[PDB]
């Protein structure tokens, strides 16, 4: 789930 930050930004 948390590789939905680093995808976002």
């Known amino acids: 789930l ?3 930050i680093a ?3």
């Open 7 to 9: 995808q976002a930004l």
């Open 2 to 4: 948390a590789a939905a």
